[PDB]
Scaffold this active site. Sequence first.
Site, PDB file in Angstrom:
ATOM      1  N   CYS A  53     -34.460 -12.744 -54.203  1.00 18.97           N
ATOM      2  CA  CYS A  53     -33.435 -11.911 -53.616  1.00 18.97           C
ATOM      3  C   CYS A  53     -33.892 -10.988 -52.508  1.00 18.97           C
ATOM      4  O   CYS A  53     -34.545 -10.011 -52.725  1.00 18.97           O
ATOM      5  CB  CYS A  53     -32.800 -11.099 -54.714  1.00 18.97           C
ATOM      6  SG  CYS A  53     -31.390 -10.282 -54.238  1.00 18.97           S
ATOM      7  N   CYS A  62     -33.545  -7.198 -52.570  1.00 22.22           N
ATOM      8  CA  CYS A  62     -34.560  -6.548 -53.359  1.00 22.22           C
ATOM      9  C   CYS A  62     -35.890  -6.255 -52.685  1.00 22.22           C
ATOM     10  O   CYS A  62     -36.393  -5.169 -52.791  1.00 22.22           O
ATOM     11  CB  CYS A  62     -34.823  -7.370 -54.600  1.00 22.22           C
ATOM     12  SG  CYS A  62     -33.546  -7.264 -55.724  1.00 22.22           S
TER      13      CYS A  62
END
Length: 103
Positions: free
Chosen positions: A29, A32
Amino acid sequence: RLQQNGSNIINGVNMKNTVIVLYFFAKWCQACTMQSTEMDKLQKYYGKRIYLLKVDLDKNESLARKFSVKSLPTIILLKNKTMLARKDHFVSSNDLIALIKKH
């Protein structure tokens, strides 16, 4: 061996009462990776005044499900096993400090 333990923090059992920062994340991700960088600054600044628990969702659906994570990154702050704050998207370390520093 490994015998069951008492509570000072419900998630981290048998140790201490500090502010734990529970951070849910995924390697894949992109949103993130930017946050993780933030956590590093946050960790350095508060040092041991807080504990960072980083959770890989990909490896714990059970937990994310329990905490009802609907996005990444997710950041939850706990002291004395009472949730203080939650963020369901990116937060700056500086922003993190402010929220944290309330306590």
